[PDB]
Design an enzyme around this catalytic site. Structure first.
Site, short mmCIF file in Angstrom:
data_model
loop_
_atom_site.label_atom_id
_atom_site.label_comp_id
_atom_site.label_asym_id
_atom_site.label_seq_id
_atom_site.Cartn_x
_atom_site.Cartn_y
_atom_site.Cartn_z
N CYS B 87 0.77 -1.23 0.00
CA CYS B 87 0.00 0.00 0.00
C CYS B 87 0.84 1.33 0.00
O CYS B 87 0.29 2.40 -0.41
CB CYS B 87 -0.93 0.06 1.19
SG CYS B 87 -2.22 -1.17 1.10
N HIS B 346 -9.23 2.80 -2.86
CA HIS B 346 -7.92 2.34 -2.41
C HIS B 346 -7.28 1.44 -3.46
O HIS B 346 -7.29 0.21 -3.33
CB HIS B 346 -8.02 1.61 -1.07
CG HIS B 346 -6.70 1.32 -0.43
ND1 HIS B 346 -5.51 1.83 -0.90
CD2 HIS B 346 -6.38 0.56 0.65
CE1 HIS B 346 -4.52 1.41 -0.14
NE2 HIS B 346 -5.02 0.63 0.80
N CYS B 376 -0.56 3.10 5.85
CA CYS B 376 -0.21 1.83 6.47
C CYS B 376 0.10 0.80 5.38
O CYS B 376 -0.43 0.88 4.26
CB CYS B 376 -1.34 1.31 7.36
SG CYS B 376 -2.88 0.95 6.49
N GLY B 378 0.70 -3.44 4.51
CA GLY B 378 0.55 -4.81 4.93
C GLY B 378 1.88 -5.46 5.27
O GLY B 378 2.94 -5.06 4.79
#
Ligand SMILES: CC(C)(COP(=O)(O)OP(=O)(O)OC[C@H]1O[C@@H](n2cnc3c(N)ncnc32)[C@H](O)[C@@H]1OP(=O)(O)O)[C@@H](O)C(=O)NCCC(=O)NCCS
Ligand SMILES: CC(C)(COP(=O)(O)OP(=O)(O)OC[C@H]1O[C@@H](n2cnc3c(N)ncnc32)[C@H](O)[C@@H]1OP(=O)(O)O)[C@@H](O)C(=O)NCCC(=O)NCCS
Ligand SMILES: CC(C)(COP(=O)(O)OP(=O)(O)OC[C@H]1O[C@@H](n2cnc3c(N)ncnc32)[C@H](O)[C@@H]1OP(=O)(O)O)[C@@H](O)C(=O)NCCC(=O)NCCS
Ligand SMILES: CC(C)(COP(=O)(O)OP(=O)(O)OC[C@H]1O[C@@H](n2cnc3c(N)ncnc32)[C@H](O)[C@@H]1OP(=O)(O)O)[C@@H](O)C(=O)NCCC(=O)NCCS
Ligand SMILES: [N+]
Ligand SMILES: [N+]
Ligand SMILES: [N+]
Ligand SMILES: [N+]
Lengths: 390, 390, 390, 390
Positions: B87, B346, B376, B378
């Site tokens: 991300c 997203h 954030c 993963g």
């Protein structure tokens, strides 16, 4: 502003569907990350970031570079990411890791590459649905790794474009390949690959297997049997399976830190990253990539072609490897003295760091002062790096 | 070295299998590359390298970043590569592109991210053969993008871990999501997304379609209809489709050059990259990634949390987005003033540059001096970057 | 040696991926089996065997005919099996069930056909493994149903061969198709299909849906709109989507017993099976199958072509349906008076019993004494059966 | 009225992924059709119809029975179709072919079965599309051939149900299998399978291979080695790979004609079809199928169990084969004197005609006058046929 390579390691290069047929790439990368840490006397808790080049990660899960670092013992506080510049991914990651320390954003970097072409899956987009008719299950290795996205043919066809443009006959390419097979076989029997290779434990069914030797290296290659091979890409071409690199699995990396950081730890580095460069070329002749990339890297280092003591030019194809040697004009006796990718293998994501490992350990073994590693990149690119011993 | 963002652009964020259902990611990236060039008055022949973050490139061909540059008119002499930090890929690529100029290895960089989650294929390793029994066709979007490789559950489960540790109830997460839907809907109706969005023409057989508006933005979201939604991951959980980000397609990038280079061209930059940082956290609570990453970025910039005038914190989940705001304690009225990923969308590989576009153009629109963008990641990571206006 | 049809029923003919998009074939067959039992007043415990033609059973499980019988309430002591003669499967199964009673091996048979072309899966042989390269996911509907196994082209190409040999122009095929669309549209609005159609309840998640009307029947087919259609098989051909049958789902069957059995139960049969025949032809012109099959059937029945009051000739293609009408020379006003497969639909495994259902109920409505049903079969075959009213 | 078997032939039974790993089923059936014609001195132009049982035809093309007849030289004027009653397909097709002659609709029929379990593909319904998540590629061999569609478990689980109800221990099932291996191995070494077996030429690129011997026959089977085998279905069960049939490929058929037809052509028939029967049983204990089917066949033939001189009872599982022998009470010394499916193999679509070939040729060898063949059928069915020698 002075970045050194504290240590380096690589797994053995496995054949396609061979020793590492069912081994994910991060499992090979984890062994290499732990190896460069042990060889340098640096603990995993000191690594700031792991940068691993990988071209074929489909189906392996979220960020295989992060999985390799976590499995190797690197704590969760550190970061990890993957990058893809095709064949030059393994070497570009080292240049990227060097830049992290040059900008003061990191102190210790594990950079390299990993690739499992055997574990590359077949894929197909099925969200829209196939209402009628047949559809193709696409090999990710061929599509995302070995096929030019602008002209649609294999990388071997680009080698045929170089062979026709450079007037490199079939016998000249086979002779170049035979020389590569003999150099790699002699280096393997003389143990010149033992220092750079870290053993890998293949945990499989019915017992564990220890792989510490390059299995793709051929023994007793003959010119006549190689002349009988049919061309693998163009029916009227010259590039065959004998004079071309193979499909392989493997991983390689290096531990990066500043020269002052290594001196306080009592580490004798394998070499100093003097300069690096990446240049693009026409995708039809992507094998000529190392020609402008090496010149720019030598230009940034302030070196002449004659100043080089050792050279590692990746042998993706005998046609492109002959052209790079003829254009740059360096002494071929110092290029791939222990063999090249034609005999050792060509794991795309890891080949950039693979030839850097061979370069570093051969420079230290024979006392070479100035070295260069370079590779051609699909899509019309090249990358090169200059290394100086301390 | 002082590197500024000369221009920035992004496509509209498309819904899952929506406007960009059959559009490859590099086609979206090519439009963004051409947009940032025209917006800054810089020609494609001047770009040294294109760096595009992408998480799901399987089946798209050799190095989709190279395809986007070539399709956008960037000459073959330049280089291009992709990178994957999940991300945070879209934002890290900008930091990586900044380092290319800081080390003097490049002059003009197009950096950003692109993602086509709709075009993500289903894959399966079939080289060894399936002698007997059924086998699974693996969704690359779920496997390589949305599933933690260390614990095996979805990213939404990590949001449930954050919600339990911070005691964030279902009503508090829905209230946060409703605020995001209303801010994004108001920003869209007021035209606050027009400057950052470059239209994309979806070429089809029955006519071309021009997409210039974020289609995933919901109109008139109601708290009662969101309270009736069932939890999407844990049967006794609180994270639902309403209070979580969606699956989306899109692309975003920025044109990077030195501050002296921008002054030579008469360019008024969107902002100056003051600092950046990436830190890792526990994969169980990866949503807390922005917390140490933002403080490290502010520490490197010499800024306090109160010095920030605007904040773009990615809303991967309402549970994780509430925790980051409570821990860092910055004024929520300056965080995602035009909505977040819960309403906008997203696209994982492009979200980092997507929120950077919204951050840059909102700073210019209201005259904000100090801004910060963070996401954030993963696997337990976070990334952040501080931007200052000129 | 006299077997009569005590009752008959069929589901509505659904469009490709339409109302029965997710309904397995045996679920449609079970409704038809239960219908013919209630319509004849015969209990499920009295059926000796169920014979259902089916061409595409891949992925449905062990013997879908057994699944249909058990689901319809037929006890486990009875037997069930499927058969495949392509498009003539639905009619041949009735003749096969008639032979079970003629040889004294059975007393009550439910015979017919069922087909779910929508549920036909894509398949590929993967036991040997695909070491390298792409492979094809084969559509079982196209491969096992619509492609000639001796020449490799579609059944529509065989229709072009019949059109070329019989000199049937594009206007003649379109005009013939329009007559079928208008006859089927008039018959549907007049309720002439209500008696033969048994409703089917499609159980879904968002509510059950009752399908009791032929969904593929189009309203207001125009000669001008069909003249604009492009040929669907040969770029310079005449067969288009308008003058050819479609892909459809459905099921049909009939309850078989001896004439003495029907008299003992007070059952008024729909008709008596006078004779049947199946003959093969050249696979290039498989559409000519009904010509020798009907003549052999009329020969076995001792009937002349002029003795027929009604004819049901399957309209797989307008080209093949015109040729059989010209050769046999029967009055076209008695051929497919309620439309044909061009307008109603063509479920391969069930079409044989589908046109038999239309024949039986149309003979009863207007008091016709002698009828004939026939279909063309892929691979170069034909089937026909003569029916006489009681 | 009286139909005799003029000739019969079968291919060798190949192991799973063995000699016939890449051989389609119709190729094996074509060889068997040509064999029964040449052995009887009947030309291909005299056969009216070919009836071949087949359970797994997915991916082989339109009507594999038609492909087998045409490849065997059967002219296009004849017809051909396939049928599926699972394990009893090979035998039921012979009874169906007999009925074609009994009703006067045909004169010469080639009836039998063919099955290629190795060529069975993996399938998945993909027309509706997979918007999100993984999906299963279903093995058609296990799903459509070996899995009960009403309870969801393997046929071996149904064998565990028969073993539990009949209290058949592990040693009792193993002893039955050892007897089958020893009888089949002795029969092969004595050449008792040569007459029924017709050689098959496996045409390949690297040379042709002649397969004329049953490859699945195990040599020197030991009772202790089967006791070491792990249970294949229930972890606490008794059915193993040793006491269960295997996965095999093969084809078998017989030439059918009236008794007067054989006498008019000077043919010495292998036997006369006295009677046949098919009965259903509980799907949980489908192995009990042969018990009521054989009793009904003997009832129609007017025979007692003591009147039988030879019996061929298919050994799908040792548990079900022991129960049928104990229940019917026939002399075990005359049942499967040359071994059964445990040692010979179990090609589902062809096993019905396979055991008929062994029955016919063994009766002629030892002068047996009355014989019976029977098989169990998945889903709870059974089939049987009585044969008397002339
Ligand atoms: C060329 C290529 C298609 C060959 O596929 P391959 O599977 O690796 O070929 P193999 O390794 O199986 O060897 C093929 C056969 O040639 C023979 N052979 C190969 N090299 C030989 C040699 N040097 N001498 C004698 N025989 C040789 C082998 O015996 C082998 O078995 P076979 O003769 O019984 O068939 C593949 O290796 C390839 O694409 N290489 C290029 C990779 C690439 O492009 N990377 C990117 C660069 S930018
Ligand atoms: C939640 C998720 C699993 C599935 O949701 P989805 O696939 O996008 O499906 P939808 O968006 O259409 O939501 C489905 C239903 O919820 C409803 N819904 C969604 N949001 C709603 C809202 N705010 N208010 C009311 N209803 C809503 C939709 O209308 C739909 O109703 P329907 O079923 O009758 O059509 C998926 O969005 C997801 O994985 N999100 C997380 C992404 C992620 O993890 N990113 C990485 C983070 S680090
Ligand atoms: C002919 C065939 C290729 C067409 O498949 P198809 O495209 O799904 O047919 P469709 O009607 O669903 O689509 C046809 C197009 O033309 C239009 N069309 C079809 N029939 C029409 C008619 N009679 N009048 C006007 N328009 C028509 C449809 O509306 C559609 O256009 P649209 O969907 O954009 O609105 C296919 O149905 C086929 O192969 N049929 C033969 C099957 C067969 O071989 N059976 C066995 C014979 S032995
Ligand atoms: C039982 C079944 C699952 C096993 O098939 P299989 O395991 O592939 O058969 P295999 O030969 O490959 O058995 C493999 C192993 O068993 C061993 N084995 C098999 N039979 C043996 C025997 N009689 N003695 C000793 N060892 C034996 C093999 O040597 C091999 O050893 P390994 O464990 O080291 O690999 C399968 O044969 C089956 O489903 N049979 C039933 C078929 C059926 O239901 N047909 C329809 C009738 S209703
Ligand atoms: N090679
Ligand atoms: N959302
Ligand atoms: N049609
Ligand atoms: N066996």
């Amino acid at each position: 502003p002075s970045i050194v390579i504290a240590s380096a390691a690589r797994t053995a290069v496995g054949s396609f569907n061979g020793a590492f047929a069912n081994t994910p790439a991060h499992e090979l990368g984890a062994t290499v990350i732990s190896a460069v840490l042990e060889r340098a006397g640096v603990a995993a808790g000191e690594v700031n970031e792991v940068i691993l080049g990988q071209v074929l990660p489909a189906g392996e899960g979220q960020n295989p570079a992060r999985q390799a670092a976590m499995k190797a013992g690197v704590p969760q506080e550190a970061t990890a990411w993957g990058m893809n510049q095709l064949c030059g991914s393994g070497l570009r990651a080292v240049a990227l890791g060097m830049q992290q320390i040059a900008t003061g954003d990191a102190s210790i970097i594990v950079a390299g590459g990993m690739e499992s072409m055997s574990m590359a899956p077949h894929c197909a987009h099925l969200r829209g649905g196939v209402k009628m008719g047949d559809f193709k299950m696409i090999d990710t290795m061929i599509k995302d790794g070995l096929t030019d996205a602008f002209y649609g043919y294999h990388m071997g066809t680009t080698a045929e474009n170089v062979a026709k443009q450079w007037q490199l006959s079939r016998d000249e390419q086979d002779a170049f390949a035979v020389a590569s097979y003999n150099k790699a076989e002699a280096a393997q029997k003389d143990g010149r690959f033992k220092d750079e290779i870290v053993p890998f434990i293949v945990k499989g069914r019915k017992g564990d297997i220890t792989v510490d030797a390059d299995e793709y290296i051929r023994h007793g290659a003959t010119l006549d049997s190689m002349a009988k091979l049919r061309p693998a890409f163009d029916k009227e071409g010259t590039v065959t399976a004998g004079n071309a690199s193979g499909l392989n699995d493997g991983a390689a990396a290096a531990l990066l830190m500043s020269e002052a950081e290594a001196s306080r730890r009592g580490i004798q580095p394998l070499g100093r990253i003097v300069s690096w460069a990446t240049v693009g070329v026409d995708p039809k002749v992507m094998g000529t990539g190392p020609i402008p990339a090496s010149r720019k890297a030598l230009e940034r280092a302030g070196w002449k072609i004659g100043d080089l003591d050792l050279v590692e030019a990746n042998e993706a194809f005998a046609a492109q490897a002959c052209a790079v040697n003829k254009d740059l004009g360096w002494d071929p006796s110092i290029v791939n003295v222990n063999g090249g990718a034609i005999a050792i293998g060509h794991p795309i994501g890891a080949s950039g760091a693979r030839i850097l490992n061979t370069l570093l350990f051969e420079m230290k073994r024979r006392g070479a002062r100035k070295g260069l590693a370079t590779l051609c990149i699909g899509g019309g690119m090249g990358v090169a790096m200059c290394i100086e011993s301390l």
